[PDB]
């Protein structure tokens, strides 16, 4: 039963370096899912959201990150946006289940969290599931620069700001994607 270190973990990583954990050789319970309902979004593609413990797959790959509440719709097949074209892009034939719930009593601090970075500019769109951890300068302008971070030389990882005194559009949602495969 390896669904106990994926959801209730201490600190998820950022959205750009989205952590992965492999699940194998144990049929999961799916008891906290679709029977506890403390989560916000359960937008679950392909397979029915109610029949999970009956079915069996080949590989169960889980991954996780933390995104703003106005960007919870971007974790989707092909729905373009800001994080779904530079940080983490699902493919168009992805089957699996997407999980999201609120996290403001854990991930927010008075004065900004300043440690949940997200990637702003990249030279092209992302491929499906391709992740990049490098912090190379985008150099939007004509000139190249040697990491000097000047005019049109950005740090591509913009830092989130997280305070408990905000709305729902600016609150970090702990979002975990489940990816399954048949053969």
């Amino acid at each position: 039963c390896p669904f106990g270190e994926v959801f209730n973990a201490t600190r998820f990583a950022s959205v750009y370096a989205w952590n992965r954990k492999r699940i194998s050789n144990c049929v999961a319970d799916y008891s906290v899912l679709y029977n506890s309902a403390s989560f916000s979004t359960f937008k679950c593609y392909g397979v029915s959201p109610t029949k999970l413990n009956d079915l069996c797959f080949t590989n169960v790959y889980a991954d996780s990150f933390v995104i703003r509440g106005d960007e919870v719709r971007q974790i989707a097949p092909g729905q373009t946006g800001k994080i779904a074209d530079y940080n983490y892009k699902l493919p168009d034939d992805f089957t699996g289940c997407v999980i999201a719930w609120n996290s403001n009593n854990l991930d927010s601090k008075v004065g900004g969290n300043y440690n949940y970075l997200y990637r702003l500019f990249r030279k092209s769109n992302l491929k499906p599931f391709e992740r990049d951890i490098s912090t190379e300068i985008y150099q939007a302008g004509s000139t190249p620069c040697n990491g000097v971070e000047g005019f049109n030389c950005y740090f591509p990882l913009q830092s989130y700001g997280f305070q408990p005194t905000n709305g729902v559009g600016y609150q970090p949602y702990r979002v975990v994607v489940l990816s399954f495969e048949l053969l």
């Epitope: 201490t10 009593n105 854990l106 601090k109 004065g111 900004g112």
Partner: antibody, heavy 118, light 106 residues
Amino acid sequence: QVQLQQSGPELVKPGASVRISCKASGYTFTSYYIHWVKQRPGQGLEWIGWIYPGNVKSIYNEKFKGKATLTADKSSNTAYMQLSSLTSEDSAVYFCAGEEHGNYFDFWGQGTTLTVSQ
Amino acid sequence: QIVLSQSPTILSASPGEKVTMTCRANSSVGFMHWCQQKPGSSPKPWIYATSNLASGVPGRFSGSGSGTSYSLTISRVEAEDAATYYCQQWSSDPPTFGSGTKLEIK
């Protein structure tokens, strides 16, 4: 290794300003917070405030707002504490603290103390 | 505003005993870290969120709990645990320490 080595013990006259140095080492200075802790002798600890040294933004306690001001010079890996309008009751020991994961101090600092002299 | 409270402020403990010290808090809080301060020296990081042991700690220390009250249980008290145990709190509010427990041997 990771270690936050501080300055020496300081004794000043009442009313003077105090600058506390906090040399960070071993880790990436521009990602971990730096907190500040106050320990009156014989008593429990008390929180002062933090200063995230990448994007400098300080936060202070309600009972520590005019006396303590924090600066963090990014390219030297040293934070600073400007304690101001020093009276006799602020005669105690001061450590640093570093954290990343929310409120859990990974690497404390060895004790430098600050007292008044007469 | 979040303020904690450690109700057993002085605990006597003979060696080879199980002693549980508690931390009561104003309202709600998430996970609850711990810390140990030897008298006259810099404190040391002792316990992570509730039950992880900071990778340098002998395995007698184990704490658990949920909701508002979180507590630490030492399996067998020895001569080396003559120090004060403080607590932080992992929440939205800034970390305000509790009072502490002093653990003395008799």
